[PDB]
Design a protein around this ligand. Structure first.
Ligand SMILES: Nc1nc2c(ncn2[C@@H]2O[C@H](COP(=O)(O)OP(=O)(O)OP(=O)(O)O)[C@@H](O)[C@H]2O)c(=O)[nH]1
Ligand SMILES: [Mg+2]
Length: 155
């Protein structure tokens, strides 16, 4: 029943924990750190680690990362490179996600990139437009699929 460790980084006020609870199961002012535990299998117990911005001892044998940023907000696309820098040494490789996340009515995000243009280091990681109420992709599926690719080659 070997667990998989997935972290959650990104700009503050971006939405990281509304995703964690929705993903980890918790139904429906930011804290340093939470850990949520969701088991998703096909015993695969998955651990969402919701981080709050300002401790490189937290990437211990980390397996995957999910970045969240508000597209309507500037520097959000660019703050994530500090998360990229501070954590992925190169701890994490490719088993990552990036969320253009609507917490608001999309004014800028809308259009030809409702996932706005990404920096070069991050242009390689799969990206989605994301919301619980506004326009959305089935990102429960992309999360489901991330755990399989993580465990896929640990053996
Ligand atoms: N309408 C809407 N509001 C959201 C959504 N996600 C987050 N919010 C609001 O924005 C806040 C985001 O806070 P967090 O999820 O903790 O973001 P953080 O950067 O992790 O801190 C939440 O308290 C919500 O009230 C969303 O998908 N839709
Ligand atoms: Mg929070």
């Amino acid at each position: 029943d070997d667990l998989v460790k997935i972290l959650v980084l990104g700009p503050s006020k971006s939405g990281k924990s509304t995703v964690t609870n929705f993903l980890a199961g918790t139904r429906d002012e930011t804290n340093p750190l939470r850990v949520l535990e969701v088991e998703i299998a096909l015993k695969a117990v998955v651990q969402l680690w919701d981080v709050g911005g300002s401790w490189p001892a937290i990437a211990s044998n980390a397996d995957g990362i999910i970045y969240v940023f508000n597209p309507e907000v500037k520097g959000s696309e660019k703050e994530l490179l500090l998360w990229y820098k501070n954590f992925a040494m190169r701890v994490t490789d490719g088993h990552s996600l990036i969320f253009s996340h609507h917490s608001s009515l999309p004014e800028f995000a809308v259009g030809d990139n409702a996932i706005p243009p990404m920096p070069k280091q991050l242009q390689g990681i799969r990206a989605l437009e994301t919301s619980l109420d506004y326009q959305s992709d089935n990102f429960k599926e992309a999360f489901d699929a991330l755990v399989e690719q993580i465990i896929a080659s640990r053996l």
